[model samples]
Target: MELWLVRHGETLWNREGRLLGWTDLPLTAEGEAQARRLKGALPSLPAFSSDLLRARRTAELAGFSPRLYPELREIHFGALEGALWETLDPRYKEALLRFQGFHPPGGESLSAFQERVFRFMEGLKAPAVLFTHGGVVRAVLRALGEDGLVPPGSAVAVDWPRRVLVRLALD
Candidate 1:
């Protein structure tokens, strides 16, 4: 099945390079504008969004009122929420940078997070658009055998368990 995975627009933490998860932050001014750019660019399909405020607002700004799902939320960061990226411990930094072996203190493990995300994708009945977190997007992209990096407010279309179709980021 085709799935369009949208990494929701930026937030203060996003711009600050802070580790954000489960903090439920709002989009920055430009974040909203970035979403607005996606309004007519996304194909109309069944839309879903993470329950986080940023994802919800991005979905709305992009002209969709998507069904909210906790399953789509970013990996629960727990104690690491708002931690500065540069100062993180070498172990954590390596884990995050490699997108594997990550088990943040008081947070979800990479394996656990991947299971949660992939389970949701497996249940989708058809093509859809998902307004979700950057980590969620990376998990999907990595599963497709790619590096799994994308900009905020970007969307990647994947063939699901197969290959990547396209990645779109509009200025």
Candidate 2:
């Protein structure tokens, strides 16, 4: 089964480098155009997205019947949401640097995020597209046994929502 994970189009928050997780922001006009470009690029397939507007809008613009699931939402960055990286407390940077080991207060732990991602996967049957956040993309990559390959912030694909497609081989 081919699993394609597409990050939502650029949001106002994304352009400003805000910690978006679960904040639910809309796409900029340019972002919408990007989604349109993606729609022109994708193969016909059923898709799904996180419950947030950004992800939903991307899928909608891409012209897919997207199934939304709360489980597909981004990670909660807690107090760090919307704070610029420079403005974040030093501890926040430290936590990010040690993201695999640190969990912010009032935020979802990395392990917890993986757990929900696993649940999301258990419900999927493949050859489908998933419109979601970066965190969700990363989690899906890890779940599909593709880790330490691509770092975030890289333009994964030219497809709608700038997604990366991972074709997981069934063992």
Candidate 3:
């Protein structure tokens, strides 16, 4: 089965370069336009999404009645959501760096997040589309043993909608 992992279109926070962890921000006008274009581009496929608006909006715009999966949500950034990377609290910055090095405080570790996302995917039927975060997509690539090939924040294409398509096929 093929898995189409779609990153949501750009949002306000995205444009502002915020950390965006668990922020639940909505799509910007451009983001909605992008999603509509993506919707026009995608082939018919079942979809799943995090319960957040940005992801859900993307899915909806893509003509997918996505199955809401809270477990599939982005990593909980805790106190860092909507904050600029540069604006991170010093201790939080250190914690984020530490997390990047090995672990972040009050948030899901990469390894743990990978484990949960993989488990969620394993429970799903194949040939699915997922509208989620870049981090989650990175985790998916890792879970599927394609980690190094699909870079973080980089999306690829599929038969579906506009320029926002970033999909990986796992046959």
Candidate 4:
């Protein structure tokens, strides 16, 4: 089955370069416009989204009333929730760079996060669209052996458990 993974539109946190994981911020005005643009960019399919406000709002603006799932939420950053990447403590930053066994002080380990995301992916029984976060998109790309970050308001299509087919910039 094909999976169309869309990163939600930009949040204030995103524009500010904050960590933004699990903090539940809303989209900026530009973000709302980006979300509306997605209506024509994606196929009409069964859709799903992280339960977070940002992602859910994106789905709604994009003309989809997707099933909401907490499992689809971004990795929990715990105590590091809104810190700027440039200002993160070196110790934490190094762990994130390694991305193997790294877990924030009050958040999930990378391995655990992967397991959660993979489990969700494994359960898909049909082609679908997912309104989610950047980290989730990165995880999917990494699993498919693709490199590069998925920008906000963008989508990547992939054949499940196989390879990436296309990368689209919705804005």
Alpha-carbon TM-score of each model against the true structure: 0.98, 0.79, 0.75, 0.96
Candidate 1, residues 1-171, lDDT tens digits: the string is 999999999999977999988998999999999999999999999999999999999999999989999999999877898899989999999998888898877889989999999999999999999999999999999889897889999999999889999999999
lDDT of 2 by residue, 80-124 (tens): 678787678787677664457546677887788878877876677
| Better model by TM-score: candidate 1 vs candidate 2 | 1
Candidate 1 accuracy as TM-score: 0.98
Backbone clash count, each prediction separately: 0, 1, 10, 0
Best by lDDT: 1
Off by over 4 Å in 4: none
Measured with C-alpha atoms, the lDDT of residue 94 in candidate 1 is 91
Give the winner by lDDT: 2 or 4: 4
Model 2 misses residue 15 by how many Å? 2.3
Off by over 4 Å in 2: 142-171
lDDT (CA) for every model shown? 0.94, 0.68, 0.66, 0.89
Ranking by lDDT: 1, 4, 2, 3
Score candidate 2 by TM-score against the native. 0.79
Q: Mind giving the per-residue lDDT tens digits that candidate 3 earns over 13-119?
A: 76676887677788888777777777656658788888898888888887889989977787777655667978776876775444443245576666677677778
Per-residue error at 105 for model 3, in Å?
A: 3.6
Candidate 1 regions exceeding 4 Å error are: none
